[PDB]
Amino acid sequence: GVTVETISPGDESTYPKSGQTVVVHYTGTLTNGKKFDSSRDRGKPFKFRIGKSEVIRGWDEGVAKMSVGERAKLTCSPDYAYGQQGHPGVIPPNSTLIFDVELLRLE
């Protein structure tokens, strides 16, 4: 489903709750490394409510395993991303997605 590989540890104490507003910096790429999204390129931290299907399932599952300050690679299989259909023009069918995600703070 989703694999979380820690790059830099968080505090292992402060974890997102269901419905909580979470603030991340992230970069998403295809497994060939082609980038398709980045809050870092936008120069703005990205906010979303976790556990509300506001983002792909890999994020809801994976970011919930991160603690504040953690930086990790999240690898989301198609079933936890955009599936067989994909996102025409952006994500091919049956694509695994790799996200570099830093959990900056909870709100």
Automatic annotation (TrEMBL):
Localization per Swiss-Prot or TrEMBL: Cytoplasm
Gene Ontology molecular-function annotations: peptidyl-prolyl cis-trans isomerase activity
Enzyme Commission number(s) from the entry: 5.2.1.8
UniProt xrefs under Gene3D superfamilies: 3.10.50.40
UniProt entry tagged with the keyword Isomerase: yes
InterPro entries referenced in this protein's UniProt entry, alphabetically: FKBP-type_PPIase (IPR050689), PPIase_dom_sf (IPR046357), PPIase_FKBP_dom (IPR001179)
Main location: cytoplasm
This protein's record includes keyword Isomerase: yes
GO CC annotations on file: sarcoplasmic reticulum membrane
Keyword annotations of the record: Cytoplasm, Isomerase, Rotamase
Leader peptide range in chain numbering: none
Catalytic activity: [protein]-peptidylproline (omega=180) = [protein]-peptidylproline (omega=0)
Domain PPIase FKBP-type per the UniProt entry, residue ranges: 19-107
PANTHER family recorded: FK506-BINDING PROTEIN 59-RELATED, PEPTIDYL-PROLYL CIS-TRANS ISOMERASE
Family statement: Belongs to the FKBP-type PPIase family. FKBP1 subfamily.
Name this protein carries in UniProt: peptidylprolyl isomerase
Native source species: Bombyx mori
Organismal lineage: Eukaryota, Metazoa, Ecdysozoa, Arthropoda, Hexapoda
Gene: 732917
